[PDB]
Amino acid sequence: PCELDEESCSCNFSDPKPDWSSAFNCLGAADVELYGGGRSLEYLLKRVDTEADLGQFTDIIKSLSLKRLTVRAARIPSRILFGALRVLGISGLQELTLENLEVTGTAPPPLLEATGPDLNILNLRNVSWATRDAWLAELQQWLKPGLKVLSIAQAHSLNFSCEQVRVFPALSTLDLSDNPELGERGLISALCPLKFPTLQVLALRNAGMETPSGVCSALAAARVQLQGLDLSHNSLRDAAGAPSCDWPSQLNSLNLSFTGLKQVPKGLPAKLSVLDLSYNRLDRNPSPDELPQVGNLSLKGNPFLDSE
């Protein structure tokens, strides 16, 4: 079922009733990967108690060497998900990665506050929830305040009910890459106002973005402040977009690589530390004023450079 190959323990519970004892092998192992194989775990509701204070195990959990957890392909009910979260709370788990999960049913709000792994990194990819516009607000109810990196991919919904969303005090990186249906307007509905006081980096790769100015527009609407913005891998268009917009005053790094650009876009910030404009379709070398003052400029890959 499981296997402690070096630091990893690819604990596999695809088969109906698994050999959980194996799990005790996935102990002392810093990296753990759980593959539910799409198997439903709604039968654990009748078997386990979510308010369980595993006396017998408390010390094990607190002594585990676990640091990076991945949980993929499984139809887990909300109750068991957060149950596990609460349990992990007393462990030293730093990074969590939920993937291809169908979290079902509603769970009651937790009693106390901040019950949860003191995570630095939380990654979600193709996770569906019982509710759909409040899943973020609810998951927050079990998260600690030190979260630094939040990655959300292929969400079925990001149009948050922002009044219920809370402040992410330490969140320095928000990665909404791979949400082809998000869009600039959709981006405004995701970046809840005043909820990312410390954001420094915002990644939006392959997220339906159309123009840098349009994105700047959304950033101003969201009253967001930040240092880096990655827009690589979007199909940016040759268009006016928003004719006027001030970029966040702290913006010093813009990525526009692999966005199929044919012209340098207008409305770029005036001064930048780095501007990655590589692997696009510029057929002419950028003119003087056409570009911002850049400390590090990349144009590698464009047609005008190839001399094949």
Ligand X SMILES: *[C@@H]1O[C@H](CO)[C@@H](O[C@@H]2O[C@H](CO)[C@@H](O)[C@H](O)[C@H]2NC(C)=O)[C@H](O)[C@H]1NC(C)=O
Residues within the interface to ligand NAG (CB under 6 A):
159, 161, 185, 189
Binding status of residue 302 toward ligand X by CB under 6 A: no
Select 159 or 263, whichever has its Cβ closest to ligand NAG.
159
> Is the dihedral angle over the CA atoms 4, 149, 274, 298 positive or is it negative?
positive
Binding status of residue 301 toward a second copy by CB under 8 A: yes
Candidates 100, 296, 303, 308; binder of a second copy (CB under 8 A) is 296
Q: Which stretch binds ligand X (CB under 6 A): 19-27, 164-172, 242-250, 253-261?
A: 253-261
Binding status of residue 288 toward a second copy by CB under 8 A: yes
Q: Could you give the 3-state DSSP secondary structure of residue 228?
A: strand
d(CA 277, CA 258): 8
Select 97 or 164, whichever has its Cβ closest to ligand X.
97
Residue among 93, 99, 118 nearest 35 (CA): 99
Backbone torsions φ then ψ of 56, nearest 5 degrees: -55, -35
268-287 residues in contact with a second copy (CB under 8 A) are 271, 273, 278, 285, 287
The answer to whether 167 and 197 have CB atoms below 8 angstroms apart is yes
Q: How far is the CB of 288 from a second copy (least distance, A)?
A: 4
Helix (H) or strand (E) holding 81: helix 78-88
Q: How far is the CB of 40 from ligand X (least distance, A)?
A: 8
Binding status of residue 130 toward ligand X by CB under 6 A: no
Q: How far is the CB of 245 from a second copy (least distance, A)?
A: 20
Candidates 104, 189, 217, 257; binder of ligand X (CB under 6 A) is 257
Alpha helices in 93-239 (DSSP H): 135-140, 183-190, 212-221
Binding status of residue 297 toward a second copy by CB under 8 A: yes
Q: How far is the CB of 131 from ligand X (least distance, A)?
A: 15
Calculate ∠ Cα 115-194-226, nearest 5°.
Answer: 105
The answer to whether 304 and 278 have CB atoms below 8 angstroms apart is no
State the number of CA atoms in the 13 A half-sphere of 88 facing the CB.
25
Binding status of residue 294 toward a second copy by CB under 8 A: yes
Q: Could you say which of ligand X, a second copy, ligand NAG, none residue 189 binds, taking C-beta under 5 to 8 angstroms by partner kind?
A: ligand NAG
Q: Could you say which of ligand X, a second copy, ligand NAG, none residue 73 binds, taking C-beta under 5 to 8 angstroms by partner kind?
A: ligand X
DSSP string for 8-69: EE--B--SSS--GGGGGGSSS-SEEEEEEEEEE-TTHHHH--TT---HHHHHHHHH----EE
**Closest residue to ligand X, Cβ-based?**
38
b/e map of 92-118 (b: 16 or more CB within 10 Å)?
Answer: ebbbbbbbbbbbbeebeebeeeebbbb
Binding footprint of ligand X on the chain (CB under 6 A): 38, 73, 100-102, 126, 128, 205, 230, 232-233, 255, 257-258, 274, 276
Binding footprint of a second copy on the chain (CB under 8 A): 271, 273, 278, 285, 287-288, 293-301, 304-305, 307
